[PDB]
Write an enzyme that holds these catalytic residues in place. Sequence first.
Site, PDB file in Angstrom:
ATOM      1  N   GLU A 161       1.957  69.958 -62.289  1.00 18.78           N
ATOM      2  CA  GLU A 161       2.759  69.025 -63.121  1.00 18.78           C
ATOM      3  C   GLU A 161       2.205  69.089 -64.542  1.00 18.78           C
ATOM      4  OE1 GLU A 161       5.658  66.478 -61.924  1.00 18.78           O
ATOM      5  OE2 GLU A 161       5.706  67.681 -63.792  1.00 18.78           O
ATOM      6  N   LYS A 167      11.749  61.130 -50.338  1.00 18.51           N
ATOM      7  CA  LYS A 167      11.059  62.346 -50.855  1.00 18.51           C
ATOM      8  C   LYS A 167      10.684  63.270 -49.694  1.00 18.51           C
ATOM      9  N   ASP A 222       3.155  68.953 -57.417  1.00 21.07           N
ATOM     10  CA  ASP A 222       2.383  68.362 -58.539  1.00 21.07           C
ATOM     11  C   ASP A 222       0.988  68.961 -58.545  1.00 21.07           C
ATOM     12  OD1 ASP A 222       4.495  66.782 -59.398  1.00 21.07           O
ATOM     13  OD2 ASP A 222       4.063  65.334 -57.796  1.00 21.07           O
TER      14      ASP A 222
HETATM   15 MN   LIG Z   1       5.620  63.997 -58.058  1.00 22.27          MN
HETATM   16 MN   LIG Z   2       6.361  67.054 -60.252  1.00 25.97          MN
END
Ligand SMILES: [Mn+2]
Ligand SMILES: [Mn+2]
Lengths: 182, 182, 182, 182, 182, 182, 182, 182
Positions: free
Chosen positions: A68, A122, A96
Amino acid sequence: LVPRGSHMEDFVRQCFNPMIVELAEKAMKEYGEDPKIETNKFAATCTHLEVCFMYSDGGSKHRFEIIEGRDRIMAWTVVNSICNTTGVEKPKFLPDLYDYKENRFIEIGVTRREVHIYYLEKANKIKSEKTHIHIFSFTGEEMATKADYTLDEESRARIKTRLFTIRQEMASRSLWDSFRQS
Amino acid sequence: LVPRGSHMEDFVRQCFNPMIVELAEKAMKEYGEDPKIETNKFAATCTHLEVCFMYSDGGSKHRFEIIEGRDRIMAWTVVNSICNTTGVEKPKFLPDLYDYKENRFIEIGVTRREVHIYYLEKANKIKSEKTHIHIFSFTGEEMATKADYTLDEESRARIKTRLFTIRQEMASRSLWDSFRQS
Amino acid sequence: LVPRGSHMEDFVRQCFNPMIVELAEKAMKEYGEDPKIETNKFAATCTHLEVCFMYSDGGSKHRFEIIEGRDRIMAWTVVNSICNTTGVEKPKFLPDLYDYKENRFIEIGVTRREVHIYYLEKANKIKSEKTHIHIFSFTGEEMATKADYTLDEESRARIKTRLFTIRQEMASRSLWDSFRQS
Amino acid sequence: LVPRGSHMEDFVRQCFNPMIVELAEKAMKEYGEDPKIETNKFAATCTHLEVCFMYSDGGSKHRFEIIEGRDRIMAWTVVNSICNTTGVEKPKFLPDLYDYKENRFIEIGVTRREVHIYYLEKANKIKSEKTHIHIFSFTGEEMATKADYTLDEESRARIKTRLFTIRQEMASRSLWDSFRQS
Amino acid sequence: LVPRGSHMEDFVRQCFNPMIVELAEKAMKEYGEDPKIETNKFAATCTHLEVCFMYSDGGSKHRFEIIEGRDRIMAWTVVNSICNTTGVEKPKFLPDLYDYKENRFIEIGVTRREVHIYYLEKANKIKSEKTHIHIFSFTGEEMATKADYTLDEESRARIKTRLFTIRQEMASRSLWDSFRQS
Amino acid sequence: LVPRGSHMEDFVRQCFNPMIVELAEKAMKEYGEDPKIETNKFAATCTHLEVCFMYSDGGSKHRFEIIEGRDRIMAWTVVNSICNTTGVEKPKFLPDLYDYKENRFIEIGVTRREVHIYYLEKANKIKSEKTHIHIFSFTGEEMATKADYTLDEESRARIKTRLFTIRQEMASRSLWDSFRQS
Amino acid sequence: LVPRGSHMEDFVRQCFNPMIVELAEKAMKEYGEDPKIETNKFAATCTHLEVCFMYSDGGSKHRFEIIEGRDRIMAWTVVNSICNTTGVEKPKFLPDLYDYKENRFIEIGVTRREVHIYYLEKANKIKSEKTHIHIFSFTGEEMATKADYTLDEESRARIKTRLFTIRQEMASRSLWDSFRQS
Amino acid sequence: LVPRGSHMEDFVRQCFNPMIVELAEKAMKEYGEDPKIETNKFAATCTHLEVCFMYSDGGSKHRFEIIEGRDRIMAWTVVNSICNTTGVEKPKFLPDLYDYKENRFIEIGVTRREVHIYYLEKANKIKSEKTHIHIFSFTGEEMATKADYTLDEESRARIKTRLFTIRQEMASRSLWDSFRQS
Ligand SMILES: [Mn+2]
Ligand SMILES: [Mn+2]
Ligand SMILES: [Mn+2]
Ligand SMILES: [Mn+2]
Ligand SMILES: [Mn+2]
Ligand SMILES: [Mn+2]
Ligand SMILES: [Mn+2]
Ligand SMILES: [Mn+2]
Ligand SMILES: [Mn+2]
Ligand SMILES: [Mn+2]
Ligand SMILES: [Mn+2]
Ligand SMILES: [Mn+2]
Ligand SMILES: [Mn+2]
Ligand SMILES: [Mn+2]
Ligand SMILES: [Mn+2]
Ligand SMILES: [Mn+2]
């Protein structure tokens, strides 16, 4: 539509370190929203990146690779470099972190709901099994795959503290309720 | 009343690093005493903050959260964030550290008396049980709750050394006796 | 022959940190090739030095002494200082690291072939036995003496990742194929 | 469409100082073009900003206010502050400088054509009279309103030199011809 | 009374450079108001100091001595040093600058009223004749003793621009009207 | 007697980091020898301090307190602070480190003779028993009290390497022989 | 041939600022001499560059463009940019400065002979008329085309002072005589 | 004799910038007095150097060469370089500046007496005619050769201000009277 300022923007610049602020402005503009208009999504992007950085800081020396905060193309470049070296399967969507002690990618979510309901959203948004998932809320709860919280009690605890103090500093400038919604 | 200078003030600026000096000026002005008048309380605030910083430095990576040296409002903000994440009870008065390996707040006292007598004063001034207490003197003694000194021999030893050298550098400028009193 | 610029040179300056760039320019000029002409050997020298630095960074505190990236004369000076202190025999050619936990010199190779074939070339180019050898490729393979990889899985893994992303960033500017050759 | 790299992008990062690079990425993304795709417009934006900065640097102490390189909203904010203080009329479109010794806004153009033809285009694109205009080309010509070149021979000369060396460093990486077109 | 935050405070930290922010917090606490409560007086103190600094920056090399932004005692110390060296008479109240080219102290006011009415208030509040007076408003007007504006058109113009853009950035966060009042 | 320069002085400034250079100039001038005349004693003081710093760097976090490199008065101040906190007896002469893991002072010698003969000289020069002793030579030998080398193989090894490379860089500028003598 | 050190090299690093040292190492290696062997030519290159920098520093704001200290290719690139903007004719060999107030290139020589004899050598080595010439010696003499010394008395005087003190600091380490020769 | 501290020393470190403090410690130790014993001469050396620096700062660009604050040998080296370049006669004793606009050396005195009486002492202590003399006192008077004050009213005025504020900050810590004496 684009204004000269905004309470949420002033607060976001006051509350976060400038580096993650620039990184968030960039993540947002790369996908086509203006930080100075969608200000709640601005605060969300800054919180998410700060949590990602504390998480990567929570481990051993260079235990994590940070995915990320890079541009999407370089992001995918590092994902390919990791896959074609470890052997793990190229995920469908950008994680991430990669976590080398445990050899897996990590999605980090930060939610103003129940860890259960985002984790649902998610987890089946991913539906890739292999990639680990880890959720924090602004209340102090977390939820992780196989109840494997990856880090130690103390670091996760520092992430919860920071989320709660952010929530208090949004409540002081009555920006919390608008933020909660969304 | 406010003078142009003072021996104690010159010594405080010579002896401590500028950062903790500014922080002490601020802690004092926030409660309404002028650093340049109440100069003994100035030296006391600087010593107390330096000890708090060495203490937080004595542990693992991010074992401590520093509560002292912040403004009272932010201080309480972090206290609430810690309580509403760990579950420990919100203390009556502001501690100096939170200690995550051992999950408890810490008051740190620095005394020119007997560790016994201050420990008495501050222990029943707290009377909150849960919050840990840890006293050092300018002689090299310490005293802690459950004789649980929280840190290792070597770090506490470094704090004692620093306190004694401060006492010697007050005695060289015959400021020690005035300081002792109070 | 010497040009005003070049795609490979622009990429080498974009892709590597300036310090190892200067060090590589210097290693090359010390042996008589111009970084701006032999640009593929420029990219090779930069990759080799970066890998050497990550390798030295992979161990404990000061586990390694870095031999690569110094001038040849100082390089040999440090080699003599190590030999005449440890007792290990002065190698025939300059290694890249000395490794004190395991008391031996290390040659680090980076190859666009099979770890087997370079290992053959460099192992009998050395033919000094004592000095350890460690090869990485731009694909993610390694090969080491006595299958003793000296470092931990995670660090070597970080070196493989970096090599693969370099290969991808050469392939994006169709410089990879020219580079492969040689 | 978005690639991993590009010759023009590597050259733009090699050739310009990082600050004006970030500023150009931002000016472009604010209007919806991706620096890594429209790379010729990237090089153009960087050249234009560098010329604006050298121009502002060419005068006395704080003779100029820089309007270019800010966000559009802050840009207009400064334009309003200048108008409502001097008395000069609020122009229709954003200039690049305000010039206080001579009390007027300045548009700065940089062209790969004839100063005559761009001057035509931009002069009747402005059609605001009051705002001054100043054009440079990559050949070393300039053209200004009332033949009033605002600066001294030496500074304008430094801007011409820099433009020509940029053109030579595009010609070395055969990027000049593609750039000329547009 | 003391809150966790405030719109005006976030804006003051966003809008001014950190140095003058600390200096203003200090000027205010030295006279007993809390920057986080009296936030309009906070913004006023920051604007006043920034104007004082631009004014001192407007002259030749070291034409001015800065009296504002120091502690009151040091402030008076420098006032005595100037008087007992030049010969000018020790004013009744602390000025903002001494001006050596013209050998006189300067009070700088910044007003949200008419330069006439503040000039009246401060001119007979001073009633010391010798000390020069110089007023700016948030509209772009100034007023000075003997119509002697001390600086050049361009610098005063830069101060007017900055005041107007501050007023626009208060109007964007509807803080302007509250600020005007007082 | 005092010259404009000297080979040994140029070499000492080339070879050591500037900080320990200033510290050595100061240690020498405090006892009344001029660094630019007694240049061999200059090189000796720099080597001794660098070894002391590497030694203190060889342990855990803050395992050591550095006594060498301070002024004599502050030096003794820290010695008193350590004694009156630990309980160890105040030595007759200034040590180089205190070592808290093992609770004892350390004299560090660096010799161009046999570790045996200096150890004899300094051991009965001390004749204080309690204080530990640790000798290195420019050849790679060491000798310590109770054969207790206090540090790990790898760190001591790094000190030996550095001493040998210093000896080689004195031999290259034929300054070694003059240095050996004394 | 390549040694571990040298008196002249130690002196060159002691005497000049590190930046011009790196630049000189680079100018020399670009033309194929090793700074650590041809050490007199090393000292000469450092003196020449320092004089070029003081000369460029002697004028107004940006009166000069520095041609010396760049790589030959970039050097020629800037020469072409200057010619194709001013109109002055492209010289046969690389000058050291361009001088925009007076519109001409400048060769700067530094000599251990008579300004007359070097001026002869370099003036008919140039034989380009247009390019200005300016010689200093280690004695304090200068000689320029049309007796037009380009700068003011005070700056040229500062260059003479620096040359003489360099000569004294070579004479102290009996390196002056070897240096004179050549 | 050497103490652990002193009021005058604490004040000297509080009052002057650290650089001139180190320079003064060095000037004193080079001539054999200990800054921590002869503390009044310490304050005197710091004041004298600060005045020398402000004086050199008072002129054009590089109008002065600073002779004070260097080591005696380098000091004389620069004196010889200036003489053997300008033609002015080598003075008997070290001046504080050379002044190139006016081609002469300058002694700067700072006195707690009458400018007349020190000027007498130092003028016939010099008795070299050529070298200019310039005295300031802690009261605000100056006295110069040929009443030629070398600088402008404003700069000299800034030096007088600074001297008076130093005198006030010695009077606040009742150190002024002891200082006056001597
Ligand atoms: Mn995330
Ligand atoms: Mn991300
Ligand atoms: Mn506290
Ligand atoms: Mn406490
Ligand atoms: Mn190698
Ligand atoms: Mn290798
Ligand atoms: Mn523009
Ligand atoms: Mn423009
Ligand atoms: Mn004021
Ligand atoms: Mn004012
Ligand atoms: Mn010692
Ligand atoms: Mn020792
Ligand atoms: Mn040249
Ligand atoms: Mn030249
Ligand atoms: Mn002097
Ligand atoms: Mn003097």
